[PDB]
Amino acid sequence: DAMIVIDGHGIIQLFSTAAERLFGWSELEAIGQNVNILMPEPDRSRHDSYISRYRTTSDPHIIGIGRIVTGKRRDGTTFPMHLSIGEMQSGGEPYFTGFVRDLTEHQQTQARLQEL
Numbered sequence: 090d091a092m093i094v095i096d097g098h099g100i101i102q103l104f105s106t107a108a109e110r111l112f113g114w115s116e117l118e119a120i121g122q123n124v125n126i127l128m129p130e131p132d133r134s135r136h137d138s139y140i141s142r143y144r145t146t147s148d149p150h151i152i153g154i155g156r157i158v159t160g161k162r163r164d165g166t167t168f169p170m171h172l173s174i175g176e177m178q179s180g181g182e183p184y185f186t187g188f189v190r191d192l193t194e195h196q197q198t199q200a201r202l203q204e205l
């Protein structure tokens with residue numbers, strides 16, 4: 090679904106059209122903001138340390154692995170999403186690209202079948 094590109098400081102550089110629909114923020118609004126605006130606490134307040142931690146230790150926890158986490162929309166509603174992260178460099182600086190897959194439907198179907 091969504092594609093997001095951030096610098097080594099967690100600041101959003103590129104925000105795809107699909108991401109706009111998924112998170113509710115427009116491209117102009119999102120750009121120049123910390124990526125932590127797309128997640129809820131406690132991850133939100135710790136995301137910078139997550140990046141900092143990786144930039145020094147170089148031990149990936151999601152990069153090359155992938156993980157299912159909770160995303161937070163503009164209207165405050167949260168949702169499950171699969172997150173894949175890629176590391177790249179441009180202009181001698183590190184950039185991270187995140188590919189997001191909305192799993193809202195999957196989760197709803199699973200809960201529904203469990204309820205019946």
Ligand code: HEM
Nearest residue numbers: 093127128132139140143149150151152158160185186187
């Ligand atoms: C919107 C929901 C998101 C949540 C809830 C989330 C959550 C997390 C978590 C839990 C970690 C640390 C994992 C651990 O310590 O075990 C992490 C690491 C990281 N996040 Fe996010 N994140 C989200 C989106 C993104 C996006 C869109 C990017 C942008 C490309 C991103 C880039 C990173 C980077 C670079 C790391 C460190 C590299 C690594 O640990 O492999 N995150 N994030």
